[PDB]
Ligand binder design. Structure first.
Ligand code: ATP
Ligand code: THR
Ligand code: MG
Length: 321
């Protein structure tokens, strides 16, 4: 029996956050916005409560949870060996960055980290998330707000498709600013490793970390619509793809919109952050539009479109290179 409470993203009503904090203290799961995607969270120090996240998501046990913190003092309670990277953390936090550290053990139970010695920490640059964590008093473990394998929720309409009647409370702060999950950098090995591309762009990370490792699984083929996804890297095969796949809807850009039948304009190449903001919404609009096949234009493997292509490659049923 779900409550949806609208709050301002800048100065949220602290009475709405106290109610969410109370539900977290009772070991309940709630949904809250961040600058990236909506989160489905619980008390990171509550084993049983975090287990409910796994069940609500329909999620495998061996997939660990990102712990959300509000302060550098909380980092010190949960992680160790970060001291040589504090300059870097202080430069990107709060913000759309998740880092892997060696766990300080103590209170973040094994279920949160899938029995791993590492923990993924994020200090989100969203006043609602920051003020909820500070008021609750404990860090929040939160995957993206979606059924496991589905596109990450970027607004309350999507949360509701996935979770109406399953959680007591959804905080609504509207459309998430970025539409894409946080960059994930692992800092626990000889050289830093990019595990997930996001709003902290690869190009920026390569400027700071010349020796950054970007693994094959990041550049090659979660986030899946209900109808089969055809990704077209080579846009000269677009004329040919549309034919091989008759019952189609297209997702294209503003500049190529007037060149298709049933088409959803995800955004413009003039403003590529608009593409990243709306891509997940586009998969959800498209799967509803009652066509057999969803057909997506590829983008430049550069800037934020790098992260978009990363998401669409893992979504795709076929990639047309
Ligand atoms: N300690 C860790 N070491 C490495 N990767 C981690 C660690 N903790 C979390 N991660 C990764 O961070 C990501 C968090 O994303 P999220 O929880 O939204 O799940 P997901 O993989 O997108 O699956 P779903 O479809 O269920 O949302 C996962 O890929 C998870 O494995
Ligand atoms: C919920 C949101 O913070 C997500 N886990 C991310 O890392 O972007
Ligand atoms: Mg996810």
């Amino acid at each position: 029996s779900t409550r949806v409470l609208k709050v301002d993203p800048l100065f949220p009503d602290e009475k709405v956050l106290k109610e969410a904090a109370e539900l977290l203290r009772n070991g309940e799961v709630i949904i809250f916005p961040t600058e990236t995607v909506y989160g489905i969270g619980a008390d990171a120090y509550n084993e049983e409560a975090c287990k409910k996240i796994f069940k609500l998501k329909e999620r495998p046990a061996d997939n660990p949870l990102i712990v959300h913190i509000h302060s550098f003092k909380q980092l010190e309670e949960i992680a160790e060996g970060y001291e040589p990277h504090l300059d870097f953390l202080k430069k990107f936090w709060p913000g759309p960055l998740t880092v892997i550290f060696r766990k300080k053990s103590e209170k973040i139970p094994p279920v949160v980290t899938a029995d791993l010695p590492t923990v993924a920490v994020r200090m989100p640059a969203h006043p609602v998330a920051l003020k909820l964590i500070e008021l609750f008093g404990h860090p929040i473990a939160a995957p993206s707000a979606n059924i496991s394998g589905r596109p990450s929720a970027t607004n309350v309409k999507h949360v509701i498709e996935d979770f109406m009647g399953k959680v007591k409370l959804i905080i609504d702060a509207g459309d998430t600013p970025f539409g894409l999950e946080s960059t994930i950098v692992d800092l626990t090995k000889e050289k830093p490793v990019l595990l997930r591309p996001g709003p902290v762009e690869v190009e920026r990370l390569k400027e700071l970390f010349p020796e950054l490792v970007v693994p094959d699984f990041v550049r090659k083929g979660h986030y899946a619509p209900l109808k089969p996804l055809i990704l077209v890297e080579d846009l000269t095969k677009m004329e040919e793809v549309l034919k091989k796949y008759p019952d189609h809807v297209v997702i294209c850009v503003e500049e190529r919109k007037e060149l298709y039948d049933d088409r959803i304009v995800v955004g413009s190449l003039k403003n590529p952050y608009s593409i990243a903001q709306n891509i997940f919404s586009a998969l959800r609009e498209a799967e509803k539009m009652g066509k057999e096949y969803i057909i997506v234009e590829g983008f430049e493997e550069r800037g934020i479109l790098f992260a978009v292509m990363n998401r669409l490659r893992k979504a795709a049923t076929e990639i047309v290179r």
